Design a protein around this ligand. Structure first.
Ligand code: LEU
Ligand code: MG
Ligand code: MN
Ligand code: NI
Ligand code: NI
Length: 353
């Protein structure tokens, strides 16, 4: 078989996110296999829980790269986790391409073996923050994770605001791999802010939103694509989440007619993956897997790690469906140039524009 590996959080604070990315990728490959696989070959996806622990991501990838004979690695979660794989030379040692890292950090476009797909965090921040400034907002607060993710958020928001002669009004942090946002909620509730940007992961974002609103917080809420709006409204409650602003960097699960969403639903039914729920992060995994599959297909029979890498670097506007194209020929930017703003409607529907 042709093997592909994944190291992500299947337990712990980030379990919801890791499970979704794995579910989407597994769904796509099971679907591909039901349809004949790739050039008559079966694709095997091997996953391993890293609990989003940086050192465990490193160990997992190195171990799997040696034992599972993979041609590529898919959707690793955590800016700090991926940066460790790059910094410690794990990918270089295995000559293993990382397709679709589940983070839009700016560093994702600085490694020959890393192939970011979705529009970056900076693109998200520029679009969302500029929209706020354009409508008159001048007082912005920021919730940030106390690690590389938070640094990306603060630096990014500060950069965009500086372009408009503005600066962050208040900021508060929380520990990575936890949802301990109590102190942050206290601080931002006291701040005289009109909007609060969430540079956080799913669980802490949800806890912050629920608590902030429950205690009288009225600021407009918005955040990075690291926060699935579907999960957010489920955990924090629609009463606190309706109105939440976001940047769409993947096909919207809410648009059932979108070709990628239609394929996801057809795949789910055909495979009989009752345990898999349609969500933004699951779609991200599905999309990453499909992009990798196309590269494997182009690599030819019994493809090697080198051939797959080569194929990836030559994908020029490959359409995953509905116009969501990926171009890896320019390594200085994300494969996808797609990005639009969206909002969570009164009843929870994610609407574009
Ligand atoms: C930037 C990362 C730390 C965020 C993480 N990859 C997530 O999707 O939750
Ligand atoms: Mg992300
Ligand atoms: Mn189809
Ligand atoms: Ni070539
Ligand atoms: Ni386009």
């Amino acid at each position: 078989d042709i093997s592909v590996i994944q190291s992500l959080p299947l337990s712990g604070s980030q379990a919801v996110t890791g499970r979704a990315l794995n579910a989407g990728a597994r769904l796509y490959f099971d679907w591909l296999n039901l349809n004949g696989g790739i050039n008559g070959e079966t694709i095997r996806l091997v996953a391993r829980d890293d609990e989003q622990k940086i050192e465990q991501t490193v160990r997992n990838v190195r171990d799997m790269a040696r034992v599972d004979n993979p041609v590529a690695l898919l959707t690793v979660v955590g800016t700090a986790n991926v940066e460790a794989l790059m910094r410690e030379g794990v990918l270089a040692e295995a000559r293993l391409p990382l397709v679709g890292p589940a983070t839009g950090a700016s560093s994702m476009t600085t490694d020959p073996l890393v192939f970011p797909i979705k529009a970056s965090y900076q693109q998200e921040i520029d679009k969302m923050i500029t929209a706020l400034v354009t409508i008159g907002v001048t007082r912005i607060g920021v919730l940030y994770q106390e690690d590389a993710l938070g640094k990306e958020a603060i630096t990014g928001v500060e950069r965009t605001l500086k372009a408009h002669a503005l600066a962050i009004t208040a900021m508060a942090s929380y520990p990575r791999n936890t949802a301990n946002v109590g102190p942050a909620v206290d601080k931002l509730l006291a701040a005289d802010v009109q909007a609060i940007f969430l540079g956080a992961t799913a669980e802490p974002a949800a806890q912050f939103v629920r608590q902030y609103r429950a205690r009288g917080g009225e600021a407009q809420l918005l955040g990075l694509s690291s926060i699935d709006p579907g999960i957010l409204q489920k955990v924090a409650g629609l009463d606190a989440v309706r109105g939440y602003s976001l940047a769409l960097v993947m096909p919207n699960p809410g648009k059932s007619v979108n070709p990628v969403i239609r394929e996801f639903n057809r795949a789910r039914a055909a495979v009989g993956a009752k345990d898999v729920d349609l969500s933004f992060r699951a779609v991200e995994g599905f999309v990453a897997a499909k992009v990798l599959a196309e590269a494997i297909r182009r690599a030819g029979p019994k493809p090697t790690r080198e051939q797959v890498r080569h194929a990836l670097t030559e994908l020029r506007d490959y359409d995953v469906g509905g116009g969501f194209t990926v171009d890896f020929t320019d390594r200085s930017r994300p494969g996808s140039h797609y990005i639009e703003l969206g909002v969570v409607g009164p009843n929870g529907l994610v609407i574009q524009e």
